[model samples]
Target: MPHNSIRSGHGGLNQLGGAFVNGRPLPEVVRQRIVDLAHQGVRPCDISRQLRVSHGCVSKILGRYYETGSIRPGVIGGSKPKVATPKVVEKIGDYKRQNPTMFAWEIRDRLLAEGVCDNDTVPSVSSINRIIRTKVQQPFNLPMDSGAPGGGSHHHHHH
Candidate 1:
């Protein structure tokens, strides 16, 4: 029979499936209190074991504390600039429909030249490519902010 694949260690404290289940960030108070209790003289795992946070998270928390006295969570990731406007998006759709083999940069360049998009108003090639993808191709996959370990083909069931 196909058996369990996880390590035969303890089942808690940041083991497996930490992105969705039991993977949410703790409250702000709980985060700061970790610093309050660590007090710089104690090891992190002790505080980790006490406060019920993942060892890695606790480790970073203390690392931040060593330099900065605040445990306030900084921006993990910032949002991309919204350079795609509705009118710009529809023009992209029009250009894509006219030429299925056109490159994404071709569309962005066209937008800039035709006054559909002005300087400092066009998105990068990546954004244009993404926009083109939605316009022409339909796939089973969607965008996500969740971090994965490997190439995203790893998943299992535990029961």
Candidate 2:
């Protein structure tokens, strides 16, 4: 049989398996059910049986609920997407004004000191780098590269 897949703007969808190539969080209803069972003292193994899901999935859902008070179910190893709040962006802008020659990594480090981050911790270098590159550039100057004159490039281009 030919492989059938549905493509959304984000990417192709796997309706048969209810998964995506760029896997997303579990459906909210399933997550809520898992959390409800967990709140009732259902162990992850038992919850898996009750919900017809894997024990690992049950464990993850409950863990997320405990940590973030929501049922955003996903694997532990994957990085959480960066979500810079407007307040944080504003703060970063202010900090940049006070320190006009800051690099992206330096700004990220400074933001870490100021406690401007998601999940109460500093963001990954890539995350910080993205914000600085997209939002922290000067109005008229060329984007400075590493070791370039007029203040070295703030971005640390990763391999």
Candidate 3:
């Protein structure tokens, strides 16, 4: 009966009772409800089936509530910084501008020769391309002065 009230959409429960939200973790209210239901002597598996949430999630919530008196989500995973630091990326961009046809390996080698980055930290060919793509895709909208050379539209007239 309680499952019938669970709607569909973000943070909503599907027909099977699973959370249908995006990447967001379960809400604090739901977690607290799980803890409260468990404290009322309800079986975790039964609660999960009724709520449409996973049994493991119910157990974990109860465990956290019992241990730490909280059902808050823990820290999520994140990647560490790669070899493509800002300085190295800028240097690579400069190389590409100076020599548009330069290969990724050539850029890597040049960076090494110029001591922009050490041999151990130097990015590979693919990594260099990825860095260039990332830098190029960055959102930038700089105002260009029309009077400046090659700054504005090009129009040729034959009189």
Candidate 4:
């Protein structure tokens, strides 16, 4: 059975998954208020529990408070850069050139160790798989029976 992988904008419907919080930035006042409430015996877990965010998010909120004393939560946390560094990218290119037959994950790990990624960021396994797949089929690599009359596999036989 072919698996149905549902992505956004498939059937002409614009599904606003997180419309409410999409562009909403956290205010410093609210952060201070949350911090104040926390200082007065409100635990981090309790804060998140009340706000309905994940436990990790609660930890990050508190950690960010300690680091910057502000909770206007928009890119204040320690997130890696969007693009990989030049040095790491060069290294990744070198590795790919040297070991073209190597698996994507292997090359990615080598890049990870060399810090070729943005701020020590490690790309996901699926991302590596996609990169390799894209590289392999660049321009276009049509199947054997691409232009066949019935548009089926070339190995199909009629007795």
Q: Of the candidates shown, which would achieve the greatest lDDT relative to the real structure?
A: 3
CA deviation > 4 Å runs, candidate 1: 1-84, 135-159
- Sequence-dependent TM-score of model 2: 0.25
- Candidate 1: 10-residue stretch with minimal lDDT: 64-73
- TM-score for each model: 0.30, 0.25, 0.29, 0.27
lDDT of each: 0.66, 0.60, 0.67, 0.60
Against the true structure, candidate 1 has what lDDT? Answer: 0.66
Off by over 4 Å in 3: 1-84, 131-159
Highest TM-score, which number?
Answer: 1
Candidate 3, number of clashes: 1
lDDT tens readout by residue for model 2, 1-87: 758966648546644434433334455555565557757788767767775888678667666644434534575665666555556
Candidate 3 lDDT by residue in tens digits, 19-107: 54533344555556655786777887776777677968876755664343444458778787645565776677789878868877888
Error of 1 at 59 (Å): 69
Query: Least accurate stretch of 10 residues (summed lDDT) in model 2?
Result: 15-24
Better of 3 and 4 by TM-score: 3
Error of 4 at 144 (Å): 9.7
